[PDB]
Amino acid sequence: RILAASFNKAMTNIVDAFTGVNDAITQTSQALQTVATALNKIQDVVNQQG
Amino acid sequence: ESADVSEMLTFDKKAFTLANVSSFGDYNLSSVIPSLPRSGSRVAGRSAIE
Amino acid sequence: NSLNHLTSQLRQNFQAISSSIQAIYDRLDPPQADQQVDRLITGRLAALN
Amino acid sequence: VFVSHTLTKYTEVRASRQLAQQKVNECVKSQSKRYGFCGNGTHIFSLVNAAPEGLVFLHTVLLPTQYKDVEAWSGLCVDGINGYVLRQPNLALYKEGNYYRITSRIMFEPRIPTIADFVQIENCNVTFVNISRSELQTIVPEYIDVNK
Amino acid sequence: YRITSRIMFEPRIPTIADFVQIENCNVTFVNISRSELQTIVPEYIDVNK
Amino acid sequence: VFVSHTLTKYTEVRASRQLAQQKVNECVKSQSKRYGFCGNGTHIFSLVN
Amino acid sequence: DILFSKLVTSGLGTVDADYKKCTKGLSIADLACAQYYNGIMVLPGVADA
Amino acid sequence: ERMAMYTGSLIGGIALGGLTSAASIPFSLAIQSRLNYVALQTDVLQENQ
Amino acid sequence: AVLTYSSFGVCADGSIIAVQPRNVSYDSVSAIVTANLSIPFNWTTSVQVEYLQITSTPIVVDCSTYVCNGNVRCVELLKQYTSACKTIEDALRNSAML
Amino acid sequence: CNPPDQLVVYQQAVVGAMLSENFTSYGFSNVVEMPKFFYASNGTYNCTDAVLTYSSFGVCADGSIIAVQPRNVSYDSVSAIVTANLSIPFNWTTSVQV
Ligand SMILES: *[C@@H]1O[C@H](CO)[C@@H](O[C@@H]2O[C@H](CO)[C@@H](O[C@@H]3O[C@H](CO)[C@@H](O)[C@H](O)[C@@H]3O)[C@H](O)[C@H]2NC(C)=O)[C@H](O)[C@H]1NC(C)=O
Ligand SMILES: *[C@@H]1O[C@H](CO)[C@@H](O[C@@H]2O[C@H](CO)[C@@H](O[C@@H]3O[C@H](CO)[C@@H](O)[C@H](O)[C@@H]3O)[C@H](O)[C@H]2NC(C)=O)[C@H](O)[C@H]1NC(C)=O
Ligand SMILES: *[C@@H]1O[C@H](CO)[C@@H](O[C@@H]2O[C@H](CO)[C@@H](O)[C@H](O)[C@H]2NC(C)=O)[C@H](O)[C@H]1NC(C)=O
Ligand SMILES: *[C@@H]1O[C@H](CO)[C@@H](O[C@@H]2O[C@H](CO)[C@@H](O)[C@H](O)[C@H]2NC(C)=O)[C@H](O)[C@H]1NC(C)=O
Ligand SMILES: *[C@@H]1O[C@H](CO)[C@@H](O[C@@H]2O[C@H](CO)[C@@H](O)[C@H](O)[C@H]2NC(C)=O)[C@H](O)[C@H]1NC(C)=O
Ligand SMILES: *[C@@H]1O[C@H](CO)[C@@H](O[C@@H]2O[C@H](CO)[C@@H](O)[C@H](O)[C@H]2NC(C)=O)[C@H](O)[C@H]1NC(C)=O
Ligand SMILES: *[C@@H]1O[C@H](CO)[C@@H](O[C@@H]2O[C@H](CO)[C@@H](O)[C@H](O)[C@H]2NC(C)=O)[C@H](O)[C@H]1NC(C)=O
Ligand SMILES: *[C@@H]1O[C@H](CO)[C@@H](O[C@@H]2O[C@H](CO)[C@@H](O)[C@H](O)[C@H]2NC(C)=O)[C@H](O)[C@H]1NC(C)=O
Ligand SMILES: *[C@@H]1O[C@H](CO)[C@@H](O)[C@H](O)[C@H]1NC(C)=O
Ligand SMILES: *[C@@H]1O[C@H](CO)[C@@H](O)[C@H](O)[C@H]1NC(C)=O
Ligand SMILES: *[C@@H]1O[C@H](CO)[C@@H](O)[C@H](O)[C@H]1NC(C)=O
Ligand SMILES: *[C@@H]1O[C@H](CO)[C@@H](O)[C@H](O)[C@H]1NC(C)=O
Ligand SMILES: *[C@@H]1O[C@H](CO)[C@@H](O)[C@H](O)[C@H]1NC(C)=O
Ligand SMILES: *[C@@H]1O[C@H](CO)[C@@H](O)[C@H](O)[C@H]1NC(C)=O
Ligand SMILES: *[C@@H]1O[C@H](CO)[C@@H](O)[C@H](O)[C@H]1NC(C)=O
Ligand SMILES: *[C@@H]1O[C@H](CO)[C@@H](O)[C@H](O)[C@H]1NC(C)=O
Ligand SMILES: *[C@@H]1O[C@H](CO)[C@@H](O)[C@H](O)[C@H]1NC(C)=O
Ligand SMILES: *[C@@H]1O[C@H](CO)[C@@H](O)[C@H](O)[C@H]1NC(C)=O
Ligand SMILES: *[C@@H]1O[C@H](CO)[C@@H](O)[C@H](O)[C@H]1NC(C)=O
């Protein structure tokens, strides 16, 4: 039960980090840091084809 | 290039304090352990191999 | 493919009288031939790069 | 110049595509014990989703939050002539109150000691638990000294 | 008799927990009786019989 | 031309950097049983400088 | 869909052209059809949605 | 500076044995534990160290 | 720090500060010894994200149209560069197929 | 006036052509409409195997264009620890992959 509750909380913060509603507090966790790194790499690819 | 290199460079103060030559007993590891900071303002220096 | 591209680049004139270095020195005095040979030198070094 | 730009990018994508296929086979389809390949902790499972020009992985790992201290022992020495060590090197024998228990060193999984959990060796250590055949029941509840 | 690891020579006294029972035997197996199994497994006591 | 030289070198470094991270996680921190990844024999421990 | 809309839409990037519309002339050619007139053909993405 | 802290932490991690209160273990025990990962050690006196 | 490069970083107000490595607790190989051992007892679930590119939009160019713009007289001059168009078109087509 | 087209070659023969107009060009007798181009071939569209493929498109030996599907495989699964009927492999075959 504790594992499931923790997983549900993490998945919510992941969607929040993809949108940007928690941008000012994303630095509080390394897990949220990986989302910033992933978004930066996707943004680079999106800005390079043309 | 500066982002993924920074992700690799992690630190552990707990494990760092075991960098003595005395922690390895009969195994001579003096050629690889960090050098003592000569005049402060830093925590470590290059080893006898670097 | 890489070798054929490098060898074929030797036939280019690079806006010179001819692609043959000997042909330039057979037609002009050294003061004028050297200026035209420099075109082949720069063009061929670009092919090597 | 354009061909040079495209060929260079195919090298970047080809390297990253092979890594993505390894992560699908080792982190998504299977469970991996290779440390650091599917996160930074103990891997459980992974999820994947489509992303622009690529894939996105959602690694699910376990991170410890609390620790338990146990007074562990290296092994048993019975009658001073019989030495015993645990069958798996990743298991540890410890004392809890008046009895003994066996746990994994990776996760705290208490287990009742059984005679099949030990491997007999030729000699003993000074650090082994001193015990006689008659009292071995206190460590292994199922043991019976039949021959005595 | 002794049991050792194939990767590194670590001798070990054979215990009944080191074996797995199977349905049939093979011609190359070591033939003993229940009465003499002690020679291979020193801790084996024939409770039955 | 200079941009081409730098990008091509970054391809070499990016591939070698990923291998270095794998060797830190599998040979330096943990003990590896993957044959040939951390030498040619049975791996015990690895150091880095 | 978040990762495909939240990020900048690649309208100015590599989007394949409707060749069936580029030669009809019923509207002035967009960026995709304009490149087709210069022989540049962006093939459909192998990663079909 | 960061390199010395990075390599120094990794070298010191080999001496960690998971003891309570972070107490360091003799390095002979660390080698013995890594040897056990290869094969279950039966040499009790550890002469090969 | 919101923007970083090597050992330097800047925060929201623009002050420059020195960046430090992330704190991590290294895992340790539990020793087989008579001592006091610390063993993980409670666990939490953490989700981490990784992005890997697997494809790039293939592009093929018709050499005759790009350089000659469909001029009939130009394509006749292009035929003298026998290995030019063939090498470019082959390189792009093979990469797209593979 | 003359935008570029693409020709599909298979076993030293032209089996089809991709066109921007609804014309039976290059002598082909059949033309079909695809989402982003017209396709001219000579074939009858009574096939399911593709000899040449690109992305979601493939062509049969007679030149008919069809939509290619992912390869069907059976994924391996972790056998759960539970009281129920379980399926366990019983027979095995040897396969060589290059
Ligand atoms: C794997 O990743 C985690 C996630 O970042 C690594 O860091 C550890 O993360 C937790 C939080 O997720 C930290 O907990 C916090 O620590 C401070 C310590 O003073 C405390 O004030 C907070 O209340 C909270 O407990 C944990 O300490 C942190 N580790 C360190 C050394 O800071 C984890 O270390 C990684 N593990 C591996 C094996 O790579
Ligand atoms: C690894 O590759 C092999 C082939 O090299 C895959 O085997 C194929 O698996 C599929 C799905 O189980 C089989 O299809 C089924 O076959 C039966 C009998 O014809 C039919 O009744 C089903 O409706 C379906 O068609 C296929 O025949 C089989 N092929 C071979 C040659 O064995 C296997 O699935 C792959 N495994 C993994 C884990 O990727
Ligand atoms: C561990 O190795 C170091 C480095 O080789 C030894 O230090 C050297 O000792 C020799 C003794 O003949 C001296 O000549 C060198 O000048 C020393 N070098 C340095 C850099 O200190 C050290 O003695 C060894 N220690 C043990 C206990 O084996
Ligand atoms: C086996 O016995 C040796 C001694 O013969 C043990 O080593 C001693 O361990 C204690 C506790 O760490 C140290 O204080 C002694 O100094 C050690 N003696 C020597 C000679 O090194 C060793 O720990 C035992 N090994 C096992 C696996 O139980
Ligand atoms: C287990 O018993 C042995 C003796 O059979 C103990 O080892 C002796 O300990 C004393 C006290 O330090 C020494 O003087 C002897 O020389 C040791 N003898 C041997 C053969 O090692 C041992 O201390 C007991 N183990 C425990 C964990 O209490
Ligand atoms: C163990 O006993 C079996 C008894 O059958 C032996 O196997 C027989 O060996 C004899 C002599 O070669 C053959 O004629 C029989 O046909 C074999 N029977 C079987 C089982 O096929 C076996 O050789 C003995 N093994 C040892 C090592 O004692
Ligand atoms: C492990 O830790 C326990 C406590 O959890 C230690 O027990 C103490 O041991 C000293 C020995 O002089 C006694 O004075 C204390 O009174 C003991 N405390 C309790 C609560 O019993 C024990 O010594 C440690 N053992 C090892 C092998 O490291
Ligand atoms: C597993 O399958 C077996 C049959 O292979 C099931 O056995 C049946 O169980 C029901 C229970 O109501 C009986 O009515 C049937 O007569 C049984 N069939 C046979 C052939 O004996 C069993 O229930 C299944 N069990 C699980 C746990 O999945
Ligand atoms: C090793 O540890 C001791 C602890 O007293 C300390 O004096 C010594 O300076 C340390 N070694 C180095 C090289 O810092
Ligand atoms: C046998 O069972 C009895 C209880 O009926 C118990 O007292 C005794 O200790 C058991 N024997 C052993 C060896 O534990
Ligand atoms: C112990 O067991 C053996 C059989 O293994 C038996 O012969 C012997 O008499 C028993 N008792 C003693 C004291 O050895
Ligand atoms: C011991 O073996 C005999 C046959 O020799 C059998 O009848 C008996 O049931 C066995 N003992 C037990 C406890 O089953
Ligand atoms: C890492 O640990 C050091 C102390 O060892 C601490 O000063 C530092 O602030 C920690 N973390 C970061 C992210 O800087
Ligand atoms: C584990 O930690 C959680 C979160 O604090 C707590 O609710 C739970 O009761 C703990 N479990 C144990 C066994 O200590
Ligand atoms: C293409 O031409 C065929 C044959 O004349 C006709 O049946 C079809 O309707 C046409 N389709 C379009 C979209 O022009
Ligand atoms: C395709 O078939 C048509 C039908 O008349 C035929 O006339 C043409 O020669 C054939 N050519 C090819 C490409 O098969
Ligand atoms: C399609 O192919 C099948 C199988 O070869 C064949 O029997 C049939 O005559 C063909 N035509 C139609 C309309 O099904
Ligand atoms: C794969 O499975 C699908 C759906 O069940 C089926 O329609 C198709 O014929 C199968 N084979 C191929 C090659 O797509
Ligand atoms: C396994 O399958 C093969 C044919 O593939 C058959 O000859 C053999 O008898 C089967 N074995 C069993 C044990 O069912």
GROMACS .gro file of N, CA, C and O and ligand atoms in nm, chain B residues 25-26 28-31, ligand 3:
model
   52
   75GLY      N    1   4.496  -0.093   0.475
   75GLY     CA    2   4.589  -0.190   0.532
   75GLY      C    3   4.712  -0.218   0.447
   75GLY      O    4   4.788  -0.128   0.411
   76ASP      N    5   4.732  -0.346   0.416
   76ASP     CA    6   4.846  -0.392   0.337
   76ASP      C    7   4.840  -0.351   0.190
   76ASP      O    8   4.941  -0.367   0.120
   78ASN      N    9   4.876  -0.098  -0.080
   78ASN     CA   10   4.931   0.035  -0.108
   78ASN      C   11   4.844   0.108  -0.209
   78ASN      O   12   4.851   0.082  -0.329
   79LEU      N   13   4.763   0.202  -0.161
   79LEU     CA   14   4.680   0.284  -0.248
   79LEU      C   15   4.721   0.431  -0.242
   79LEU      O   16   4.641   0.519  -0.274
   80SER      N   17   4.844   0.458  -0.199
   80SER     CA   18   4.892   0.595  -0.186
   80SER      C   19   4.909   0.665  -0.320
   80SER      O   20   4.909   0.788  -0.325
   81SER      N   21   4.924   0.590  -0.428
   81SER     CA   22   4.941   0.648  -0.560
   81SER      C   23   4.811   0.700  -0.621
   81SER      O   24   4.817   0.766  -0.725
  692LIG     C1   25   5.335   0.257  -0.015
  692LIG     O1   26   5.389   0.299  -0.138
  692LIG     C2   27   5.446   0.428  -0.134
  692LIG     C3   28   5.470   0.477  -0.274
  692LIG     O2   29   5.555   0.388  -0.342
  692LIG     C4   30   5.573   0.416  -0.049
  692LIG     O3   31   5.635   0.542  -0.035
  692LIG     C5   32   5.769   0.537  -0.090
  692LIG     O4   33   5.854   0.460  -0.008
  692LIG     C6   34   5.982   0.440  -0.063
  692LIG     C7   35   6.057   0.345   0.026
  692LIG     O5   36   6.177   0.307  -0.035
  692LIG     C8   37   6.049   0.577  -0.078
  692LIG     O6   38   6.171   0.562  -0.146
  692LIG     C9   39   5.963   0.669  -0.163
  692LIG     O7   40   6.026   0.794  -0.170
  692LIG    C10   41   5.825   0.680  -0.101
  692LIG     N1   42   5.741   0.762  -0.185
  692LIG    C11   43   5.646   0.845  -0.141
  692LIG    C12   44   5.573   0.920  -0.250
  692LIG     O8   45   5.618   0.863  -0.023
  692LIG    C13   46   5.534   0.369   0.091
  692LIG     O9   47   5.650   0.349   0.167
  692LIG    C14   48   5.452   0.241   0.084
  692LIG     N2   49   5.407   0.208   0.217
  692LIG    C15   50   5.386   0.083   0.261
  692LIG    C16   51   5.341   0.073   0.404
  692LIG    O10   52   5.402  -0.016   0.192
   0.00000   0.00000   0.00000
